Design a protein around this ligand. Structure first.
Ligand SMILES: CN1CCC(c2ccccc2CC(C)(C)Nc2nc(N3CCOCC3)nc(-n3c(C(F)F)nc4ccccc43)n2)CC1
Lengths: 170, 934
């Protein structure tokens, strides 16, 4: 009348205990592998947020540099005109050359920001592959845990002492 | 690599670029910039150097006005070496605190603004308002009230009538008056004594106060001198106290430095599942979404599932999931939960991720419209319940790469709907002999017939079993708004329960806002001393909260603003978890609010965080160099890195984070070393007017803090019963990501190091450390400390006790270090038996083979300690239940709680528990001999 779904190598106690050891070994191995991957997940998440706030810091730096450009274009106007009607074109050259140096510096920071943007893009795909590997590991890990517990229950019903169980779980 | 090329932006638009030293301060850099700017155009238009202030982009990606021009450039740590000259204008004080806050709490304040969340902005506005209010009121209070706030009394729990001398000194005078006082003198009485001594070798006593030399610890109040921590320690240690006379005037210098009712909406609840995003799963499987309503951990209807869709990055369902509950029956704290999983086609189920969402917002409004829930990855556990209702309702901050669900709450009314106000709840909630027997039988999980009876006589529970409120809260059917209305009606009239019962009510099983408010209302009786005992658990249950503005955050900020020491440890409890994305938002907001009300302590915390940063870099240097070069030659490489001006100044002249009253002044570089084992912890020595700390990086020290905190709690509970077991409750404090500090006990050594110089080296070391008459006293301290730590380690289930992780003080006091696991865990779970060690039993017996009298005294010490702990087992259980929010791997299920239930034998009477403890002790005695005979 009662036909429960027993999925164990229903045989001698020594054989089920042997496979209990093998399943528990595989489970602890799969758990160590998942724990390694979950560590990489946490580190990659920390590094990605670090790169994302550093991108904002680049943004704030370029913003300040563009404010400096605008301030120069306004402040220069009055003087640049006077120096011309005064023969101080050498100093106009000085102001213009200094402002050109500011331009080239902006291009350098723009280049470094784009480099970090590419690093973040690479690490973003890294994060997605670490999460995919974890998601392809979990089904096994849970199945290995359920199988180990099932063999443990079968042995407990048959009357196996706790000492022999501990021997197989070492 | 001493120089760094810096860009300079002048207010006239001129750009300058030259190298400066990484170690020069901003004042020197400004003088250098002004020496170079005079040879650049438009210099004749700038004002003097002191009219401008440097501005940079700091590590938190925020603009910061570099006001302290004594800061070195390496300490400023700009993103890029870019300094901009701007005007000295604005509030300046507000800009200063705003910038220092972002650097102190490890998160930029702009990240809150960028969220564009009204709940966040409303929290900051309200919380920072109240905190600034309390800070302003504190600045008006008298000097005695401020001396209270900044340094609360450190008192013993608590006495004979002894009399001993004391060295009382005055400020700025090497001359000091030594005189005798009684151990029961109020500090005002000793105060007037040193006064009449000063005027005869004409101020008033009540204008002064007493300070411990070399520490920020003060003696005052209406307490006897013996009850003070420093004095009571001075008697047992034998040292004569050293106090300082401080005028009030010196303390002031420190102080100055639209109505569509919800219950008429009988339609069932439903949501529109639309689309997923950024899903990474096996291409051969199918994706399903599970959804269910929850109040705490209880289901409110069936778990309505979706259909299978092929695995892809952006799966689309566009299905409506209808739930078996009406809108008018959804509780206020109704928590709806998703869990996306991958299933093999019907033709090893895998939980992919999960996400929870409140059905009502923080403004009591039923949420309607489009919602995007960024999920958290599912971690496999023991109870593979796909739905994870105990998770936080906060969203995953990693928004650019994490998975999410697009769901839609449907409109239900023309005008928006709210949860009814309290008055509309009490209007609904307003409406024998044999049964009293089963009520007493039941309250002394429930069962169905028992649940309905307790709910039947709910008024009898309130009128005769008030401490059983938690049971009545669990039998209430929250999926029926009529049952809810009647329960909250009784709750709004429940009598005040003791702190013990309120501690249980703070658990996640009781999520109703009204319940938490009732609990907090009972926790307001707590003294600052007692509140500090549960501070760690109180912080952990903040992760259980659903909204930002809550009663518990209100209460914790209240006490932190009233007690500087409580605020200090609240800060570090929150700061040490800012790397955890689940709580970074909530904690950061609390931390910002706290800083605005504690501008004074902000300076202390800033100095501590900088020293902690230098220690991390120092430990990193040692870790990288200890594997290539032997330990002897790595020590001086450490030393060379420490005597740098930036390093030496940052690690010196600070308040210890383990104890803000302990002053860490001068670093003894020579006495600094490290441990060439795992983690390579640092050993930092100091010398003030001599303290040590241990900087451990690599391991989460939270479990070690909880362990030492629980041992310290047993010590206080024992001293409350007149049982002093001569403990050594040293402190452990996590400060950051796998980073913490450990208090160092001086004059102590391991069991092993003493036993390596037949095995009487223990007794011989005690003889050489306590000569002649002092031996007997030392043996007594050993006996008491051995009993208390034996009982403590057995109760907490801390095995793996061997010569390496037990230490002895030169006074004979024993204590433990390096608690790797507790609750019976080892390299696997199993009850750790009671352990007696023959090497120790040799010492209580004073070297004799058989000293019955001394041994029965030691057994009475053990049994009295275990007995007292059994009397407070519910306290330990409640504290551990709340501690399950911390996520400690060895404290996650009810089996860990059951370990404390069995170790303390709470299911048995006191007689039966003591008899079983007797048997366990006896078998431990028999096992101690067989331990070393082999
Ligand atoms: C010749 N030198 C002398 C200096 C020694 C030295 C160096 C660095 C760090 C530490 C030492 C000390 C030593 C013996 C290795 N032991 C030690 N001492 C404590 N103390 C805390 C109480 O006061 C007493 C000192 N604490 C721990 N400890 C650690 C450890 F990882 F750091 N993790 C812990 C977790 C919880 C509780 C304690 C913990 N372990 C190395 C040789």
């Amino acid at each position: 009348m009662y036909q429960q779904d027993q999925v164990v190598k229903e045989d001698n106690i020594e054989a089920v205990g042997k496979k209990l050891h093998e399943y528990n070994t595989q489970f602890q191995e799969k758990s160590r592998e998942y724990d390694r991957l979950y560590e990489d997940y946490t580190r990659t998440s920390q590094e990605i947020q670090m790169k994302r706030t550093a991108i904002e810091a680049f943004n704030e730096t370029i913003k300040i540099f563009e404010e400096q450009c605008q301030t120069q274009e306004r402040y220069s106007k009055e003087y640049i005109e006077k120096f011309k009607r005064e023969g101080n074109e050498t100093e106009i050259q000085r102001i213009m050359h200094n402002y050109e140096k500011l331009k080239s510096r902006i291009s350098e920071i723009v280049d470094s920001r784009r480099r970090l943007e590419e690093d973040l893009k690479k690490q973003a795909a890294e994060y997605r592959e670490i999460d995919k590997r974890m998601n392809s590991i979990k089904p096994d890990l849970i199945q290995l845990r359920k199988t180990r517990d099932q063999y443990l229950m079968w042995l407990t019903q048959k009357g196996v002492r706790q000492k022999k169980l501990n021997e197989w779980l070492g | 690599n001493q120089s760094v090329v810096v860009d300079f932006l002048l207010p006239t638009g001129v750009y300058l670029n030259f190298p400066v030293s990484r170690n020069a301060n901003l004042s020197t850099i400004k003088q250098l910039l002004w020496h170079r700017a005079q040879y650049e155009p438009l210099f004749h238009m700038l004002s003097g150097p002191e009219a401008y202030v440097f501005t940079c982009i700091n590590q938190t990606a925020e603009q910061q006005e570099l006001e302290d021009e004594q800061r070195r450039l390496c300490d400023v740590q700009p993103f890029l070496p870019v300094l901009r000259l701007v005007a000295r204008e604005g509030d300046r004080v507000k800009k200063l605190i705003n910038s220092q806050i972002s650097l102190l709490i490890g998160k930029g304040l702009h990240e809150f603004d960028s969220l564009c969340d009204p709940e966040v902005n409303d929290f900051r506005a309200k919380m920072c308002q109240f905190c600034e209010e309390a800070a302003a009121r504190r600045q008006q209070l008298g000097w005695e009230a401020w001396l209270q706030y900044s340094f609360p009394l450190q008192l013993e729990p608590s006495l004979p009538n002894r009399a001993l001398l004391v060295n009382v000194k005055f400020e700025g005078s090497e001359e000091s008056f030594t005189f005798q006082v009684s151990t029961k003198d109020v500090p005002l009485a000793l105060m007037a004594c040193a006064l009449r001594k000063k005027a005869t070798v004409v101020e008033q006593p009540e204008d002064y106060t007493l300070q411990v030399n070399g520490r920020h610890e003060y003696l005052y109040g209406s307490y006897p001198l013996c009850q003070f921590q420093y004095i009571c320690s001075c008697l047992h240690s034998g040292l004569t106290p050293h106090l300082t006379m401080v005028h009030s005037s010196s303390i002031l210098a420190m102080r100055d430095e639209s109505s569509v009712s919800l219950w008429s909406l009988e339609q069932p609840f439903r949501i529109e599942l639309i689309q997923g995003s950024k899903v990474n799963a096996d291409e051969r499987m199918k994706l399903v979404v599970q959804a269910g309503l929850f109040h705490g951990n209880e289901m409110l209807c069936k778990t309505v599932s979706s259909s299978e869709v092929s695995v892809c990055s952006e799966p689309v369902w566009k299905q409506r999931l209808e739930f078996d509950i009406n809108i008018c029956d959804l509780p206020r704290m109704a928590r709806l939960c998703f869990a996306l999983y991958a299933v093999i086609e019907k033709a090893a189920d895998c939980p992919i991720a999960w996400a929870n969402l409140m059905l009502f917002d923080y403004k009591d409004q039923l949420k309607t419209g489009e919602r995007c829930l960024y999920m958290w990855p599912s971690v496999p556990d023991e109870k593979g319940e796909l739905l994870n209702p105990t998770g936080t309702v906060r969203s995953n901050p990693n928004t650019d790469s994490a998975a999410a669900l697009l769901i839609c709450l449907p409109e239900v009314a023309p005008h928006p709907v709210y949860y009814p106000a309290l008055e509309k709840i009490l209007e609904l909630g307003r409406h024998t002999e044999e049964e009293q027997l089963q009520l007493r039988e039941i309250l002394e999980e429930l069962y169905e017939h028992e649940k309905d009876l307790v709910w039947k006589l709910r008024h009898e529970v309130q009128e005769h079993f008030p401490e059983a409120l938690a049971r009545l809260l669990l039998v209430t059917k929250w999926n029926k708004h009529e049952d809810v209305a009647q329960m909250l009606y009784l709750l709004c009239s429940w009598p005040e329960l003791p702190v013990l019962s309120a501690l249980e009510l703070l658990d996640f099983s009781f999520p109703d806002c009204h319940v938490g408010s009732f609990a907090i209302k009972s926790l307001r009786k707590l003294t600052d001393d007692e509140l500090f005992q549960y501070l760690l658990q109180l912080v952990q249950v903040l992760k259980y909260e659903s909204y930002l503005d809550c009663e518990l955050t209100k209460f914790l900020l209240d006490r932190a603003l009233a007690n500087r020491k409580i605020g200090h440890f609240l800060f570090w409890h929150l700061r040490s978890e800012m790397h955890v994305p689940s709580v970074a938002l909530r904690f950061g907001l609390i931390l910002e609010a706290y800083c605005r009300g504690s501008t004074h302590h902000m300076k202390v915390l800033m100095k501590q965080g900088e020293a902690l940063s230098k220690l991390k870099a120092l430990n990193d240097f040692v870790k990288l160099s200890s594997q290539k070069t032997p330990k002897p030659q790595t020590k001086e490489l450490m030393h060379l890195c420490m005597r740098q001006e930036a390093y030496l100044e940052a690690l010196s002249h600070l308040q210890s984070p383990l104890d803000p009253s302990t002053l860490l002044a001068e670093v003894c570089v020579e006495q600094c070393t490290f441990m060439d084992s795992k983690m390579k912890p640092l050993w930092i020595m100091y010398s003030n007017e001599s303290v040590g700390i241990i900087f451990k990086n690599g391991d989460d020290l939270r479990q070690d803090m909880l362990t030492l905190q629980m041992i310290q709690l047993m010590d206080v509970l024992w001293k409350q019963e007149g049982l002093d077991l001569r403990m050594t409750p040293y402190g452990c404090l996590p400060t950051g990501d796998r980073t913490g500090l450990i208090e160092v006990v001086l004059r102590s050594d391991t069991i092993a190091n003493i036993q390596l110089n037949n095995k009487d080296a223990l007794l011989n070391w005690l003889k050489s450390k306590n000569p002649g008459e002092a031996l007997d006293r030392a043996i007594e301290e050993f006996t008491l400390s051995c009993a208390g730590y034996c009982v403590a380690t057995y109760v907490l289930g801390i095995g793996d006790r061997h010569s390496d992780n037990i230490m002895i003080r030169e006074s004979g006091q024993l204590f433990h270090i390096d608690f790797g696991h507790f609750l019976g865990n080892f390299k696997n779970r199993e009850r750790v038996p009671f352990i007696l060690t023959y090497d120790f039993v040799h010492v209580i017996q004073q070297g004799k083979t058989n000293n019955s009298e001394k041994f029965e005294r030691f057994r009475g010490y053990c049994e009295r300690a275990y007995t007292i702990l059994r009397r407070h087992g519910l306290l330990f259980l409640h504290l551990f239940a709340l501690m399950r929010a911390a996520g400690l791997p060895e404290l996650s299920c009810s089996k860990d709680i059951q370990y404390l239930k069995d170790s303390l034998a709470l299911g048995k009477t006191e007689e039966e528990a003591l008899k079983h403890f007797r048997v366990k002790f006896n078998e431990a005695l028999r096992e101690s001999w067989k331990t070393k005979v082999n």
